[PDB]
Amino acid sequence: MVSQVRQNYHSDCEAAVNRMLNLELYASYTYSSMYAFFDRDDVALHNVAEFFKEHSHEEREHAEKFMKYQNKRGGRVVLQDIKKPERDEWGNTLEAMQAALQLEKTVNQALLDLHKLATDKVDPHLCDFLESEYLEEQVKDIKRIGDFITNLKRLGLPENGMGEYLFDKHSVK
Amino acid sequence: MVSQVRQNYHSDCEAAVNRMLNLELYASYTYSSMYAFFDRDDVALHNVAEFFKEHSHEEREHAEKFMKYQNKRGGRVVLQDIKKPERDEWGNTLEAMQAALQLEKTVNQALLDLHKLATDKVDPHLCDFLESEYLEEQVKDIKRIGDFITNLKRLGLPENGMGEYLFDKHSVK
Amino acid sequence: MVSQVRQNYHSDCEAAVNRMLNLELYASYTYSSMYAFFDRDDVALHNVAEFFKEHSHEEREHAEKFMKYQNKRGGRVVLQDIKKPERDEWGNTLEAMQAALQLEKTVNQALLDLHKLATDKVDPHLCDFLESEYLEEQVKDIKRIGDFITNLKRLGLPENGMGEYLFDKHSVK
Amino acid sequence: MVSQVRQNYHSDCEAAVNRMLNLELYASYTYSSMYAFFDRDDVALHNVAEFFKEHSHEEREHAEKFMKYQNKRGGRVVLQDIKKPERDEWGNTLEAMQAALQLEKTVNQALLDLHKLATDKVDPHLCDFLESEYLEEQVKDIKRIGDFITNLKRLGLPENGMGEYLFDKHSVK
Amino acid sequence: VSQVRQNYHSDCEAAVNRMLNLELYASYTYSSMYAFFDRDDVALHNVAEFFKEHSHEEREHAEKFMKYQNKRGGRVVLQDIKKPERDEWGNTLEAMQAALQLEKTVNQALLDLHKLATDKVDPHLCDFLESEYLEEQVKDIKRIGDFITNLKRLGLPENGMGEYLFDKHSVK
Amino acid sequence: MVSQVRQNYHSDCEAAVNRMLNLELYASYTYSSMYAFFDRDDVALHNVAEFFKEHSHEEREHAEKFMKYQNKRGGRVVLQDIKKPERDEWGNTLEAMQAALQLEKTVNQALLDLHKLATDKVDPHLCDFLESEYLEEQVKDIKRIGDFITNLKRLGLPENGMGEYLFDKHSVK
Ligand SMILES: [Fe+3]
């Protein structure tokens, strides 16, 4: 039955890592959709699209990390469908940064939930993995999205076309 | 109603490009699974694993290109679920490669069919884009895999571990 | 009497390439007019002027390729008056991008009509040249200019002058 | 209603500058036609062809300079049709060079006529522009074309093929 | 049938084979021209070197077809490379005029294969031919017609001084 | 009549050099066929394929040297059909290396016969040429090939797949 390498690894932590994986993939795809929206000719915000495209890659990397992690602890990667995103169309920069804030908070909650599971099962290696690789990155992302949303409001979104334009030239590279 | 940018881009073609988009993502996902499989402690063929990982990256780039294309032509990217792979475990390098051959031939047939679609709808721009960016790349990837399967059979797979071993040290980086 | 080099080049095609060459010069001249317009002291949008100046040179260079292509296949360049552009005056950046877009689609449709002539005449060399040198650049320019228009409208044009100053500093090289 | 920048610029000179610009474009167009003639497979004199291709770029830049000059002085650029050149077919390197001689002398007279007008209308800036930017380059080009014609006659043109061939290898770069 | 073959008509396979032989033929003919211009009593060394370069260029076209055949999963089958038409090529003009003719014949062969590939709805083959042969062919025909015009201008066949000059100036 | 350059070149030697030339071309063609066979997807031994490829280039260099030699001595290159190789299919690395040895020996026997002919016609020059440029290269080629075949046999050809695989990675590199 069990991997020659498995040690102190609970079944449930294994399953949780598979859930978290798929969730990282769901996040990726969502962002990949924003990139396509912001590259549309009637949207035309190139730096905002590039920003979501980057995040989309950040997220896909986060997933791989879980695959690697699973194999290392001797658990077995089991894949589920990656569900299409909530919307096909994202309104504008602020609607999108707002979706992004929730998507990040959702995923951060799953993380913190998995950390709690790991503490309950006394798997310090999983706790620390999450602490070093994920937890601090979500708190930077959320803080950076928060800052954007604030600035986007400052710029008079949703209504102020010129403020949306400025944001794209000045807050992303 | 129609995009300011659309010219000579038939509704049908637009829809096929979204189908094609879903296929590249589907394939990238399959290769991802194959990568995680070979990385398992009880498979442990690092170089085969890395081969499939680089391929799931190649297929993800293929996907992004259709996204970029759709918007260039003034179509709208509409996303579906990404289906999980046919399998959760891939047997061994031979079995994995036969499945890779299959997947590349399926994807190829879909590209041939879109080429046909686009010919009938008299779309030279889309025809060329298929020729330059997909068609040739596909025959290359398919010949490579055929070569590998032959070499894999030469090395006495499935039965022959020393064979599978040598393959991973020699036929891939 | 028949070029020694001529092979598989139908005379309607030769005729059409000459026609296409003239439209190429026309688009070039139009962009030249816009260049002169944005350099007026009462217009004074210099980045906009330069962009059209570069376009003026891109088209002149498309014209040049046709003369070569004509001689390469053994056809014979016949030139025709280059007609002055539609307007002596172009309103503002938005008005001009909008004309440009119209012109790029006219030139595009003319390229597509020629690609049809060549397909009917079973001339794959000319089909290929068109696809490789012209067809893709056209969709890139149409996408691009659409993208600009979107941004122009976002920025409050034709009414918003600040909106206009900014486009000229940021959207355009 | 008069541009804020205009000072000492007679309207006659404004018209005359528009007429001049159009001559430079005419000259340009003629040189293109010589370029394409010498590139024909039944003419095949590559260096002579390139020589004319360069002169047609130099005349294009002469037109650009007049556009700039109009705006600088506060005048308004008004464009006409650029007329097809006088021939479709240029004989041989001699006849072409004789035609270029007549073309440069024509454009020269036009410049002197504009100088006289400018002297009459007491516009010393327009004079000086003419003297620094056009007048001396016109005498050089004419001297240069002079010389070439004298050499084609020496080399036995129109009848001596071998003459024509050497000129292409030696007299032009 | 090959584990790699997909959408590749038997007929095309055969034509690709027919075509390879043509490339080799052309190559062999240029090689013969090199020998000719290298003769002591012809001795136009640059014109020789130009034909020797061409027969390499051709032998590379032959190779590319072999590689294509295998990529599509077809099977290379070779035939006798038939010897060139002439053992002696008169002079630079005759030679260049034969080379034009040959270039046109190989080009037609290529056009016929593109047509066949179009009829069998094989875009990969079309694009290969478009990308790798048709455009190199029009360049070659042009360059060659350019040489012929210049040779006639130089008074060939009669004028030796002309032939001499051509070998010094027109070819690298 | 006789070439201005001919001296001590017996006419039978001139014929044999022509005969020799065809042999070299012929060998070239056989090695080409071996190239294509090893590049087959169901054969797929790329390094063995590249070896035969290089070898057919080498043999064409040989044939050219004979054209050069022929003209140096004043004889006249006469060309024959290059017969197609003896098989369309080479079975495997061992069979092909065996065919290579026979072919290299047939060519060597021919070069010997020619040396013997030139010794009898008292043509030291032709003797030196066959010695400097061919005879020693033949014994190297033959030693390399017999080495190979010994190793193919050692590695268990034709039966052993892993043997053939290894040979391709280490004996040709
Ligand atoms: Fe994440």
Ligand SMILES: [Fe+3]
């Ligand atoms: Fe995240």
Ligand SMILES: [Fe+3]
């Ligand atoms: Fe793909």
Ligand SMILES: [Fe+3]
């Ligand atoms: Fe693929």
Ligand SMILES: [Fe+3]
């Ligand atoms: Fe254009």
Ligand SMILES: [Fe+3]
């Ligand atoms: Fe354009």
Ligand SMILES: [Fe+3]
């Ligand atoms: Fe001028």
Ligand SMILES: [Fe+3]
């Ligand atoms: Fe001039």
Ligand SMILES: [Fe+3]
């Ligand atoms: Fe060829």
Ligand SMILES: [Fe+3]
């Ligand atoms: Fe050729």
Ligand SMILES: [Fe+3]
């Ligand atoms: Fe040899």
Ligand SMILES: [Fe+3]
């Ligand atoms: Fe040999």
